[PDB]
Amino acid sequence: VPATRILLLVLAVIIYGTAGFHFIEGESWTVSLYWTFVTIATVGYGDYSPSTPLGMYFTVTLIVLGIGTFAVAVERLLEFLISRHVVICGWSESTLECLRELRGSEVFVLAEDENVRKKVLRSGANFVHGDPTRVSDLEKANVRGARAVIVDLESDSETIHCILGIRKIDESVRIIAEAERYENIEQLRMAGADQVISPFVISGRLMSRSIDDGYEAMFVQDVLAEESTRRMVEVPIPEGSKLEGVSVLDADIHDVTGVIIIGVGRGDELIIDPPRDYSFRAGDIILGIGKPEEIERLKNYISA
Amino acid sequence: VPATRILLLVLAVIIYGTAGFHFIEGESWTVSLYWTFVTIATVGYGDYSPSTPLGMYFTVTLIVLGIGTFAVAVERLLEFLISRHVVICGWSESTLECLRELRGSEVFVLAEDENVRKKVLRSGANFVHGDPTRVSDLEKANVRGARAVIVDLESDSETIHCILGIRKIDESVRIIAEAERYENIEQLRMAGADQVISPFVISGRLMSRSIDDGYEAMFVQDVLAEESTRRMVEVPIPEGSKLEGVSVLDADIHDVTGVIIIGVGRGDELIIDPPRDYSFRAGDIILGIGKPEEIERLKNYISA
Amino acid sequence: DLEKANVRGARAVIVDLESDSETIHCILGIRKIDESVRIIAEAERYENIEQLRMAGADQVISPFVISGRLMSRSIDDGYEAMFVQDVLAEESTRRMVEVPIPEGSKLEGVSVLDADIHDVTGVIIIGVGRGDELIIDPPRDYSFRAGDIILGIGKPEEIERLKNYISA
Amino acid sequence: VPATRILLLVLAVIIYGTAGFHFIEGESWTVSLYWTFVTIATVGYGDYSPSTPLGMYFTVTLIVLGIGTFAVAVERLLEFLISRHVVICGWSESTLECLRELRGSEVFVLAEDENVRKKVLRSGANFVHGDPTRVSDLEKANVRGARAVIVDLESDSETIHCILGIRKIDESVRIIAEAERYENIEQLRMAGADQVISPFVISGRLMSRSIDDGYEAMFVQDVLAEESTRRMVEVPIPEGSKLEGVSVLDADIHDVTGVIIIGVGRGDELIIDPPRDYSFRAGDIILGIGKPEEIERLKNYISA
Amino acid sequence: VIEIIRKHLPRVLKVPATRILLLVLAVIIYGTAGFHFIEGESWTVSLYWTFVTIATVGYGDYSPSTPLGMYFTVTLIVLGIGTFAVAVERLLEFLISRHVVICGWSESTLECLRELRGSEVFVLAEDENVRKKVLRSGANFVHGDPTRVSDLEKANVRGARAVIVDLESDSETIHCILGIRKIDESVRIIAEAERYENIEQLRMAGADQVISPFVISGRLMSRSIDDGYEAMFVQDVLAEESTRRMVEVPIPEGSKLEGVSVLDADIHDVTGVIIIGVGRGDELIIDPPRDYSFRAGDIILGIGKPEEIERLKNYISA
């Protein structure tokens, strides 16, 4: 049945109700409409009632009509009722441990499988069912407003196809991709990806360096865990700092603060172990390791 | 449970209730009947309630009896109370692009998947769930009174088994099939399809002409597009025209109109580039390419 | 595994893989090896034609669009599918060919109206190709150029009468 | 959750409410019970109300408390208010065309798959989900009371296992089985099957006899179809007939009735084309072909 | 009647109780505040009245006094009761030695469940079709993957008496034994080996007793060629319906046989059981020698009638 049949039947009764109480009892529309509601509601507060054989007749008829149409309209109603965001294209084991560190923000997981709807909703993310290679299904997941898009699909052919689809929707958003083979690192980066993270090349080099002594693999998997003592943080150099123009040899950040200056980055490059003649500028980002008591001693050090 | 089984129980409660108010409470019939209904409807205005223990036990009993049977009766009453088309058998990418040019007509889609229901209803076509190779599930899609049936199934064995099921319903509808292999073009014409469209023979013979110059594959993919400047339309010659018996050299269509006469079809045969001594008749369908400013110039020249 | 198959010394690469994402990825691998080879791709979905052509493919043939357009045009009369599937077959009576306009030809600057190619020769001029565009049904004031390509439909005895009419 | 568990929960509430009004408001037992009931039944009449904040808290609690279980008890109460069989083991294409001629009787289809529940219920049969090789799942399907059990399983190893399982449940029931290979005809028959029907040996011999002329295969598939003109029927010879002691040559049934005596069967054997010296006895069953007007002329012929 | 509708539509019980609660609370707030600020009721009354109003009772001790009160109340009731009915339905939905845990469901654990009808048994399996077989046998079913530590803790592995692991392969049986030993290293794991070569891997992972059935079966099908008496003895003394049973009788502290040799004890002469082994700790000596000295703590493995078993316990008693 059309929803409009249900609605018209409801409306017909309140009109009937209101009008008859007026015609039979001589009551005003305010109380007539109200009383009709009171009877439909089956509450009976005790103010208005019919006081004539016809009013009683009318009222009983009215109640039957009222509840019937009301209850139907209500069940339909109930049935109907029943910074920026980050978009994650594809669901895998790399984007699952990425989602635990992105708690608190809005995350939209665009995935082809419907089976993965329970695991996405359990971890605190909105699921958007679609194919992440289709441009019409990326726009559904609100890619254009996002602050970053994380692409980790089944192959490296679908990862370039999803990267090329974002570069025409928004040519300014930050794309982070995951390469599976070493040949496609410069292929995903030319097609638009701002950061290419290859997990089988990191783990391929941490397994050939753990044969003699595995301290290279213990440094990498402990400075990234956000439950240890030291945390690899990065702080930016603001405008009008005390270090805008000093060399690294004269700044001497490790002794006066306690952090370790493993590298500094200007723009889109990184200089690991900067030499002593490196003049600090404004806008630089200092990548460092230290205890969180030493980080606040560095943040006040680089202030105005 | 007949409706009348339910209705008897409801009335029995009503009569019982009404009479007790009448002889236990001493109420007149208009108020006792009213009260009984109201009691059943549990409204409680505040006018009548039992004023003696007999009535109190009686009324509590009426209420529970009333609610059970009333609720059922109401639930049941409400549940009881409140040219031609084209049919597309199967869903693939070739029938998705066919559905884009059939938005003005009404289209049924007979496919056995359930996941494709969201793609069909978006495109503006009614979805009929069923197996297209079965005669019982072909009759649900209104094959018998259709304009044309378009068969595109997963293989060429099921396309033949679906063409022979349509020809069992009626031998007058127009079947337009699609061949997957080149060798099965002659089997799909013996089963009963009127037009067999083999896309991988058109595509494979355009990827071999596009090695030197890609002008053959640029002409085919452009005149079929309705957004193009020139269009390929079939102009029929009406009965009582000024061109019956006239040869192609004596007519000179390209000089006076401006369209390009690339073929003339009589019945179900087409003669591409017809010779000079080809005599026209009434009934021959002219296949031409021209601007839309030139097409109505052609119909006004061959008119009666 | 592309450099095994001699893509550098080739004259045309025809990319038709199992899905549309692998056809873009293989086109991107060919353009790293030889930047001037002629790639002839094949799109499955309609929306991926502008991506296959941006990634490097010169000609994109989409078979599910040519078949979808010829299905909905064959409901009333099927003379447009009987035209396409018959001029391409090389066992047919009439062939669709391309002839080039040589340098120093008889038709330098000559318009198509006063050339009268269908009257003189008998071939049907459906388009004049210049470079990387095709003009279907060129207008009457269209002037030629030494170096055009005439696309036409005609009998095989009428193509030799066309090449001898455009000869130098 | 027994219905009585629900009822106990309800009673606890009505008892509780009644006592609290008695001790909180100081009301009598008769009115406190009435009031609590009426309150739960949400009538709203306006006679009894709490007069203290404690009474208010109490009353509100009773309403929310009692209404839940009140409604549920009503649901349970309303739910309470409102020849022999043939068992078919396994679902296939042989037991589907067997089920169409067994319309009108009770048929229980014991099958392992749950997918086949829709096709069994559509054809007019009760579905019993179980494994037909398990003796505990045959007894669930009521094999012991049946008049015949039809076994058609996936292999001939499961068909002997289902036949052996019935022979210990009931050693008198009639088992009809279907053999797949020719070697197992005497193996299924020794394990207990009363009739072994091998479809690939009938169809293997009807395909090697249809090469020259296919009249052998047209006779078999037309005398079994119950929509043709002639029907292969069998009538029994009763006690005290007119033929108990006559030979076939002197009975001369084909001329005086019109049926064709293809064979007669005594006990558990069949004699096809009985000779002229064959003396008819009592209890014999005459297998014959004829029009249904000729069958009634034969049935009265063999009477008392 | 909405409760009728709810019974008609349990099909929409798809959302969190938390959404349900927030919405009903918003309604009672609307109601109570209007009674306090529009009708002029006290907060005790306003809430009381609001409840009564929402619940659709409407006694009339309090009633709207102005058109505004009437308009207000109509809204309050029409929205509140619907929500109320929903909240009620969700509540009803919600309202209505130690154990052993069995990881996995096969035919070997089906016959183990017949012997354990007196104890309470959890079954941790990842199939859903097996729920009808477990509840028939009298064991609580816990859905989950037994190789996961999070789904092992749902089955109460940490406070169990013994855990019985029988999974589909020997790789998952090892991956489940190592997940149980991560929860607690004191529970008793009883595993089952599918191949003979993986008996030593399942003891290194942490199982206390590895029961390889295809090595017992394969070594009984090779002794039953000549005479089938070896495979007739094993399949009979394990049955509790047999006339003889193999029971372990422990020697208590302060017994009359500490230091006594087997020849000086002569158990088979005085009792009538056959002493086929003596276990000390986790080692078993089948057919112990003559000069084997008893102690307190040695578990005697014997075969005898039930009329002879309590005769043995009364002979070794303190």
Short mmCIF file of C-alpha atoms in Angstrom, two decimals, chain B residues 45-148:
data_model
loop_
_atom_site.label_atom_id
_atom_site.label_comp_id
_atom_site.label_asym_id
_atom_site.label_seq_id
_atom_site.Cartn_x
_atom_site.Cartn_y
_atom_site.Cartn_z
CA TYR B 45 -11.71 8.92 31.04
CA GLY B 46 -12.96 8.93 34.58
CA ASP B 47 -16.70 8.65 34.28
CA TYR B 48 -17.36 4.97 34.96
CA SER B 49 -15.52 2.35 36.96
CA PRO B 50 -16.99 -0.42 39.14
CA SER B 51 -18.22 0.77 42.50
CA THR B 52 -18.63 -2.60 44.19
CA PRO B 53 -16.16 -5.58 44.57
CA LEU B 54 -18.25 -7.71 42.25
CA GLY B 55 -17.71 -5.12 39.55
CA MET B 56 -14.05 -4.77 40.41
CA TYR B 57 -13.31 -8.45 39.90
CA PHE B 58 -15.62 -8.53 36.90
CA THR B 59 -13.96 -5.51 35.31
CA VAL B 60 -10.42 -6.74 35.88
CA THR B 61 -11.49 -9.92 34.14
CA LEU B 62 -13.05 -7.99 31.26
CA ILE B 63 -9.87 -6.06 30.81
CA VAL B 64 -7.61 -9.03 30.43
CA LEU B 65 -10.04 -10.83 28.18
CA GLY B 66 -10.51 -7.67 26.18
CA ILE B 67 -6.87 -7.00 25.65
CA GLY B 68 -5.98 -10.43 24.39
CA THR B 69 -8.80 -10.77 21.87
CA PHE B 70 -8.97 -7.11 20.92
CA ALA B 71 -5.31 -6.99 20.11
CA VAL B 72 -5.66 -9.99 17.85
CA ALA B 73 -8.74 -8.73 16.13
CA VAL B 74 -7.19 -5.39 15.47
CA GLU B 75 -3.98 -6.91 14.14
CA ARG B 76 -5.84 -9.12 11.75
CA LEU B 77 -8.16 -6.43 10.54
CA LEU B 78 -5.26 -4.18 9.74
CA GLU B 79 -3.22 -6.89 8.06
CA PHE B 80 -6.14 -7.87 5.82
CA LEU B 81 -7.11 -4.21 5.24
CA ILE B 82 -3.74 -2.52 4.89
CA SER B 83 5.48 0.69 -27.96
CA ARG B 84 5.69 -2.31 -25.62
CA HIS B 85 8.42 -3.27 -23.14
CA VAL B 86 11.78 -4.94 -23.73
CA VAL B 87 13.17 -7.84 -21.69
CA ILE B 88 16.88 -8.28 -20.94
CA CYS B 89 17.98 -11.80 -19.97
CA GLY B 90 21.20 -11.68 -17.99
CA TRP B 91 23.34 -8.86 -16.63
CA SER B 92 26.78 -8.01 -18.00
CA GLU B 93 28.64 -4.93 -19.19
CA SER B 94 27.12 -5.16 -22.68
CA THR B 95 23.59 -4.94 -21.27
CA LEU B 96 24.58 -2.15 -18.88
CA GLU B 97 25.38 0.11 -21.84
CA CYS B 98 22.24 -1.09 -23.62
CA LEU B 99 20.18 0.05 -20.64
CA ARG B 100 21.56 3.59 -20.94
CA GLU B 101 19.91 4.11 -24.32
CA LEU B 102 16.62 2.50 -23.23
CA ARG B 103 15.65 5.00 -20.53
CA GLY B 104 12.56 6.15 -22.43
CA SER B 105 11.15 2.62 -22.65
CA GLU B 106 10.27 0.28 -19.81
CA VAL B 107 12.75 -2.55 -19.27
CA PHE B 108 12.53 -5.83 -17.36
CA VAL B 109 15.78 -7.53 -16.35
CA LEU B 110 15.80 -11.28 -15.75
CA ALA B 111 18.95 -12.33 -13.91
CA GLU B 112 19.62 -15.01 -11.33
CA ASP B 113 21.96 -13.04 -9.07
CA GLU B 114 20.68 -11.05 -6.10
CA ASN B 115 23.66 -8.69 -5.77
CA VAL B 116 22.83 -7.01 -9.10
CA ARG B 117 19.49 -5.66 -7.84
CA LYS B 118 21.14 -2.40 -6.76
CA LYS B 119 22.66 -1.83 -10.21
CA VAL B 120 19.45 -2.48 -12.15
CA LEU B 121 17.15 -0.26 -10.06
CA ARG B 122 19.64 2.62 -10.25
CA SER B 123 19.53 2.51 -14.07
CA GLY B 124 15.72 2.62 -14.18
CA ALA B 125 14.66 -0.94 -14.96
CA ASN B 126 12.44 -3.40 -13.14
CA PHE B 127 14.29 -6.43 -11.78
CA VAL B 128 12.79 -9.92 -12.11
CA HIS B 129 14.65 -12.57 -10.14
CA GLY B 130 14.86 -15.92 -11.89
CA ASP B 131 16.81 -18.25 -14.10
CA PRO B 132 16.49 -17.17 -17.76
CA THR B 133 16.92 -20.70 -19.15
CA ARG B 134 13.64 -21.85 -17.54
CA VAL B 135 10.34 -21.39 -19.37
CA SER B 136 8.51 -20.86 -16.07
CA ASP B 137 10.87 -18.03 -15.05
CA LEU B 138 10.78 -16.52 -18.54
CA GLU B 139 7.01 -16.11 -18.33
CA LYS B 140 7.37 -14.06 -15.15
CA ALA B 141 9.32 -11.44 -17.11
CA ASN B 142 6.56 -10.98 -19.71
CA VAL B 143 8.43 -12.46 -22.66
CA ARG B 144 5.15 -13.24 -24.44
CA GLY B 145 4.09 -9.65 -25.05
CA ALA B 146 7.46 -7.96 -25.44
CA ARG B 147 8.90 -5.85 -28.23
CA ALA B 148 12.34 -7.47 -28.22
#
